[PDB]
Design a protein around this ligand. Structure first.
Ligand code: G2P
Ligand code: GTP
Ligand code: MG
Ligand code: MG
Lengths: 426, 347
């Protein structure tokens, strides 16, 4: 009961997905072969949420891997945990998208997509009651953004009543990796606005800050960064996988955190986060976790929560904890930091608690905030788009893939509207 | 510059023979043109209830039409000036509203029979326009679309299937691939629309044999130019828009069909979106402190209607209710919505 379907689109998305799978298999006591070697019966009770049971006491991720390039697939298959995936669930093209949203959405991606659709239909049929979909990808390139968006549109058309979740790695302001990133982000964000029910805005710059400042990590690799994201992902759906004292799944979270249809862009966070040295000089207690989570410098989106207000915040706690203590701490934070919370939604905080902690830790926390500061992310992007579009820079490539200028105009308008709406509700 | 103007009227249907045969009591009384009272049929057994007298539930309107009102009377005393606004180069919008089964389609649009005010709207439009045509050539174009599960059906020409909305240079809204018929008479547009009704998604629900599952949106464009076609012209394209709002639904207790539950939710959501858009437009028109974005984005209905709703336009909400206590709850909710559509405490 309550099966989730996982989709990974483009290189980054795939990489994050791999990490996610690795963590979750470890959590549920699943080895690199698909066999259960755990101790606790609780690890297998709700195994069906993320895994299909294959013949001969093995488990396989309900995961679809998508890319316009084959190399990524190979890299995944050769990775630790690569062999756990169903071979028929790898759907790859041969060409690539060349950082072009149009190639991913209209051309190469279009050709690819039917196969993916066929796979995912089968995966849906297999599951007794699919609660919904989780897509991991980025907005800045061509595949994850254009192809991903296309896929999402198709999915929603066939499953309009199911929950649609995306973990979207967004382009940061300073660390600009590509030149057409503004275009790709703009086009994809628009589509996300209409077709996702909740969107987790993850930002590389913020991750780097976390790694450098909070973990004090000498050399971050993408794997390390990805780990953080994976942890966050695991946090959200802990209530579907384990028992607890107060239980909240994907739907319950959405209903409590989304007051208006369009405002479904979250700034996620995780706690605790310490170095090796600073491990000894700390208190493993709920007050400390709470303190950590609400800090601006612990957000995985490059936005200052102190530049806006929290519309709603959901906190998900894992480990053996006193409910009273949890409640006290959340009330204290809202009373003390009154100015950071919208005053016309009393009790801006939703709490959920799962008894099963993550491995290595006795207590852990996951944060989901709907903050009006997310407007900053959109605004910058809009500005950059304007700067490009005013001089029609790089437009020709997109137009060569069948895209028309008017779409760009529309998307930009839409994003502007969204920004305005956030501002006004602040 | 939101200068939004919306009149709110309501038509009380005459109590039907079926309602009389079923013992219906008269919950609806009209005290004035400006107001209607719905007599909530409480048993009043408690002293508190007898003291409060909650039975007298008042709602605020510009013109409440009683049980004897006809299609011609609704036209003459409500949309008549909206037609004029279009003739004069402005946009205007009419919204039919009520619980499904309320008779919205027949009062406003018709379906071969019961011409509705839509016939009357076009009948005067074309008489005035044909006269004006002597100096200013007119092209009265007509489209008819279906807004269903946020997708748009071309009703006049179903071969375009389900369409999206796009922003124009100068950001008005166009439905892609919609058929536009240039007409000269009400007979042409009325038959065109009634034929188009054949392509609407409708189902035999418990509350209504013909319950619309969608918002039927008429877009009649009164395009004009001085007949001196070789001269530069500041032409007009006033749009006379009429919306058959999907009926409100709370029949999901028995409508357990997957699609009816989907449609129901989308209908109610978009009816509420319209409500929120209206509240915002009214607040801005009033000049309140609520300076913000009008949430036209909340539905395809409102995104499209933005072009008339946010400007120097005349709009009208025409609700449909019943005097019978047997449907008190539907009349109550219908009146409540309409009251909130107006947002004026004159009653
Ligand atoms: N947080 C992470 N970000 C990544 C990772 N790999 C790439 N990226 C970021 O994503 C962007 C590059 O995206 P992709 O390689 O996924 C583009 P994709 O392969 O999906 O389509 P193509 O345009 O066909 O290459 C850029 O901002 C990178 O800095 C990762 O492992 N973690
Ligand atoms: N006294 C007490 N209250 C509880 C307990 N568990 C949850 N609550 C309270 O119950 C309310 C939340 O409702 P739940 O019972 O968890 O929700 P539910 O009935 O399962 O409804 P859904 O999960 O929304 O389907 C809150 O006021 C909690 O504080 C408990 O063990 N004891
Ligand atoms: Mg790639
Ligand atoms: Mg419950």
């Amino acid at each position: 009961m309550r099966e989730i379907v996982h989709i990974q689109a483009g290189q980054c998305g795939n990489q994050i997905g791999a990490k996610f799978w690795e963590v979750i298999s470890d959590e549920h006591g699943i080895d690199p072969t698909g066999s259960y070697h755990g101790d606790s019966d609780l690890q297998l009770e709700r195994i069906n949420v993320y895994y299909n049971e294959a013949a001969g006491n093995k488990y396989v991720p309900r995961a679809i891997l998508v890319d316009l390039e084959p190399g990524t697939m190979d890299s995944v298959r050769s990775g630790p945990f690569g062999q756990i995936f169903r071979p028929d669930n790898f759907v790859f093209g041969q060409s690539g998208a060349g950082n072009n949203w149009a190639k991913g959405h209209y051309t190469e991606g279009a050709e690819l997509v039917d196969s993916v659709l066929d796979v995912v239909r089968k995966e849906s049929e297999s599951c007794d009651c699919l609660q919904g979909f989780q897509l991991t990808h980025s907005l800045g390139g061509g595949t994850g953004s254009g192809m991903g968006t296309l896929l999402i549109s198709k999915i929603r058309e066939e499953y309009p009543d199911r929950i649609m979740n995306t973990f979207s790695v967004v382009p940061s302001p300073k660390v600009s990796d590509t030149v057409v990133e503004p275009y790709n982000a703009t086009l994809s964000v628009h589509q996300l606005v209409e077709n996702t029910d909740e969107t987790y805005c993850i930002d590389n710059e913020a991750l780097y800050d976390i790694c450098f400042r909070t973990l004090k990590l000498t050399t971050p690799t993408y794997g390390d960064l990805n780990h953080l994201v994976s942890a966050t992902m695991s946090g959200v759906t802990t209530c579907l996988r384990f028992p607890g004292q107060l239980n909240a799944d994907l739907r319950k979270l959405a209903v409590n955190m989304v007051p208006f249809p369009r405002l479904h862009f979250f700034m996620p966070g995780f706690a605790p986060l310490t170095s090796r040295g600073s491990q000894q000089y700390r208190a493993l207690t709920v007050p400390e976790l709470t303190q950590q989570m609400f800090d601006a410098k612990n957000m995985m989106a490059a936005c200052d929560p102190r530049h806006g207000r929290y519309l709603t915040v959901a906190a998900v706690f894992r480990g053996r904890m006193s409910m009273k203590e949890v409640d006290e701490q959340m009330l204290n934070v809202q009373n003390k930091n009154s100015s950071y919370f919208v005053e016309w939604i009393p009790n801006n905080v939703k709490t959920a608690v799962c008894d099963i902690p993550p491995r290595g830790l006795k207590m852990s926390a996951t944060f989901i905030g709907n903050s009006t500061a997310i407007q900053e992310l959109f605004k910058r992007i809009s500005e950059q788009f304007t700067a490009m579009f005013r001089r029609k820079a790089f437009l020709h490539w997109y137009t060569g893939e069948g895209m028309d200028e008017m779409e760009f105009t529309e998307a930009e308008s839409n994003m502007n509207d969204l920004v305005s709406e956030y501002q006004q509700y602040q | 510059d939101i200068t939004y103007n919306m009149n709110v009227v309501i038509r009380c249907r005459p109590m039907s023979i079926s309602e009389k045969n079923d013992g219906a009591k008269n919950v609806i009384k009209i005290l004035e043109n400006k107001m209607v009272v719905l007599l909530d049929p409480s048993d009043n057994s408690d002293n508190v209830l007898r003291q409060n007298r909650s039975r007298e539930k008042k709602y605020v309107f510009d013109y409440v039409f009683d049980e004897n009102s006809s299609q011609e009377d609704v036209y003459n005393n409500s949309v008549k000036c909206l037609i004029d606004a279009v003739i004069k180069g402005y946009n205007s919008t009419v919204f039919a509203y009520g619980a499904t089964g309320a008779g919205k389609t027949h009062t406003i649009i018709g379906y071969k029979n019961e011409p509705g005010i839509m016939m009357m709207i076009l009948k005067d439009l074309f008489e005035r326009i044909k006269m004006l045509q002597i100096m200013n050539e007119y092209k009265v174009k007509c489209s008819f679309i279906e807004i269903y599960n946020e997708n748009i059906c071309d009703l006049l020409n179903p071969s375009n299937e389900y369409l999206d909305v796009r922003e124009d240079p100068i950001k008005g809204v166009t439905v892609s691939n919609i058929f536009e018929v240039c007409t000269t008479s009400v007979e042409e547009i009325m038959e065109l629309i009634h034929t188009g009704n054949r392509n609407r998604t409708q189902e035999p629900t418990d509350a209504n044999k013909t319950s619309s599952r969608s918002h039927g949106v008429l877009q009649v464009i009164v395009e004009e130019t001085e007949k001196g076609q070789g001269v530069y012209q500041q032409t007009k394209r006033g749009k006379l828009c009429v919306i058959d709002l999907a009926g409100s639904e709370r029949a999901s207790q028995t409508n357990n069909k997957g699609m009816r539950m989907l449609e129901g939710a989308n209908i109610n959501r978009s009816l509420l979106a319209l409500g929120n858009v209206i509240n915002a437009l009214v607040l801005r028109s009033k000049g309140n402190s609520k300076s913000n974005f009008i949430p036209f984005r909340d539905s395809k209905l409102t995104r499209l209607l933005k072009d008339s709703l946010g400007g120097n336009c005349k709009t009208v909400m025409i609700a449909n209710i019943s005097p019978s206590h047997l449907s008190y709850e539907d009349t109550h909710n219908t009146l409540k919505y309409a009251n909130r559509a107006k947002n004026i405490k004159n009653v």
